[PDB]
């Protein structure tokens, strides 16, 4: 009999599984092929929260749209801000709002897991050793992944990569990359912004356009077709978090290395 913990997105299930093991039974609120920004929890999901012993929030206003429905679905449900203690990054354009995509940084994930481990232990003291051990193990894996991604992205001549959505600001900062976002939410309307991106893309010789897995690629392909580049997807909600960050680092490396 495990502990019922609910999380917002699939990447967190990877996290809770690494820390909780068979000590927790994880449920995800947002399906991996869904857009969290415009996501609406379903009645059945809200009812299931009555059994949730806790809910692990990404933090930084990620749950903002459903937070209240959560507290209304189960007030006795423990809310775990796995983003606490971490210094955010302002969103691409406006600074007023902090960027929630910290789950995509191996180094920051070390802090998010620590917090999760800590809270899971307070709720279930008997297994404090397991949470602490699992945590220590995951932590080592994180440094291994961070060092592996580093070497992959360190030598690249091109540090910029075109993304349909700026979901990789943290990942980018960690490894000295700069994302060029096609579409950022909450920005001063600039219909010709994509013309500026394409011209800049051609002058820098950006070879690829990376769309987001949960979104249409029409605009990306169209932009790509103009830059004379190719299209690939980058999935920030991937369940296989670790292997995915590497696939992502490899996509970047493939596009940002001296081209054949």
Residue 53 shares a structural domain with residue 107: yes
Over the Cα atoms of the chain, what is R_g?
Answer: 19
The pair phi, psi for residue 47, each rounded to 5°, is: -70, -35
Residue 144 shares a structural domain with residue 30: yes
Q: Scan for tokens 């191996």, then name that residue.
A: 106
Question: Closest by alpha carbon to 217, among 182, 253, 255?
Answer: 182
Cβ neighbours of residue 27 closer than 8 Å, sequence gap 6 or more = 4, 5, 6, 7, 48, 52
Number of domains in the chain: 2
Residue 1 shares a structural domain with residue 116: yes
Neighbours of 218 (CB within 10 A): 9
Q: What is the 3-state secondary structure (H, E, C) of 160-218?
A: EEEECCCCCHHHHHHCCCEEEECCCCCCCCCCCHHHHHHHHHHHHCCCEEEEECCCCCH
Neighbours of 44 (CB within 10 A): 7
Residue 15 shares a structural domain with residue 46: yes
Contact 118, 16 (CB under 8 A): no
Q: What resolution in Å is listed for this PDB structure?
A: 2.5
Last residue in a domain, options 154, 180, 197: 154
Which two structure tokens, joined as six digits, stand for 35?
């857009």
CA distance 67 to 34: 18
Residue 21 shares a structural domain with residue 99: yes
CA distance 20 to 1: 12
203, burial (CB in 10 Å: exposed 0-12, middle 13-18, buried 19+): exposed
Residue 257 shares a structural domain with residue 160: yes
Residue 196 shares a structural domain with residue 219: yes
Structure-determination technique: X-ray
Residue 167 shares a structural domain with residue 140: no
Question: Closest by alpha carbon to 108, among 98, 100, 119, 96?
Answer: 100
Contact 149, 245 (CB under 8 A): yes
Residue 69 shares a structural domain with residue 190: no
The pair phi, psi for residue 162, each rounded to 5°, is: -85, 125
Cβ neighbours of residue 233 closer than 8 Å, sequence gap 6 or more = 210, 211, 212, 213, 217
Residue 141 shares a structural domain with residue 184: no
**165 assigned to a ligand binding site:** yes
Q: Tell me the CATH number at 165.
A: 3.40.50.1980
Last residue in a domain, options 154, 181, 212: 154
Task: Tally the C-alpha atoms within 13 A of residue 167's C-alpha that lie toward its C-beta.
Answer: 23
Question: Closest by alpha carbon to 139, among 151, 131, 129, 128?
Answer: 131
**243 assigned to a ligand binding site:** no
Which two structure tokens, joined as six digits, stand for 53?
């012993």
Q: What is the 3-state secondary structure (H, E, C) of the chain?
A: CCEEEEECCHHHHHHHHHHHHHHEEEEECCCCCCCCCCCCCCHHHHHHCCCCCEEEECCCCCCCCCHHHHHHHCCCCEEEECCCCCCCCECCCCCCCECCCCCCCHHHHHHHHHHHHHHHHHHCHHHHHHHHHHHHHHHHHHHHHHHHHHHHHCCCCCCEEEECCCCCHHHHHHCCCEEEECCCCCCCCCCCHHHHHHHHHHHHCCCEEEEECCCCCHHHHHHHHHHCCEEEEECCCCCCHHHHHHHHHHHHHHHHCCCC
Contact 33, 39 (CB under 8 A): no
CA distance 192 to 241: 35
Contact 163, 223 (CB under 8 A): no
Q: At what angle do helices 128-153 and 241-256 cross, to 10 degrees?
A: 10
Residue 170 shares a structural domain with residue 91: no
**185 assigned to a ligand binding site:** no
Last residue in a domain, options 126, 154, 182: 154
Contact 245, 145 (CB under 8 A): yes
Range of the domain at 232: 155-260
Residue 49 shares a structural domain with residue 116: yes
CA distance 96 to 243: 33
């Amino acid at each position: 009999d495990a502990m019922d913990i609910t999380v917002s997105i699939p990447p967190q299930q990877y996290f809770l599984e690494k820390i909780g093991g068979d000590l927790v039974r994880v449920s995800v609120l947002v399906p991996g092929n869904n857009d969290p920004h415009t996501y609406e929890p379903k009645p059945q999901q809200l009812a299931a929260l009555s059994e949730a012993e806790a809910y692990v929030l990404i933090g930084l206003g990620f749950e903002q749209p459903w937070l209240e429905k959560l507290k209304a679905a189960n007030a006795n449900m423990k809310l775990i801000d796995s983003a606490q203690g971490i210094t955010p990054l302002e969103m691409p354009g406006r600074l007023m709002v902090a960027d929630p995509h910290i789950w995509l940084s191996p180094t920051l994930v070390k802090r998010q897991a620590t917090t999760i481990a800590k809270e899971l232990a307070e709720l279930d003291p008997d297994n404090r050793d397991q949470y602490e051990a699992n945590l220590a193990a995951f932590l080592a894996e994180l440094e291994r992944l961070n060092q592996e991604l580093g070497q992959i992205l360190q030598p690249l001549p091109q540090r910029k990569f075109i993304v349909f959505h700026p979901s990789w600001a943290y990942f980018a900062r960690d490894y000295n990359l700069v994302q060029i976002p096609i579409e950022v939410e909450g920005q001063e309307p600039s219909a010709q912004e994509l013309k500026q991106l394409i011209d800049t893309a051609k002058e820098n010789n950006l070879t690829m356009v990376f769309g987001e897995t949960q979104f249409s690629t029409k605009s990306s392909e169209a932009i790509a077709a103009e830059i004379g580049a190719g299209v690939e997807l980058l999935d920030p909600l991937a369940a296989d978090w670790s292997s995915n960050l590497k696939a992502v680092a490899q996509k970047i490396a493939n596009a940002n290395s001296a081209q054949p």
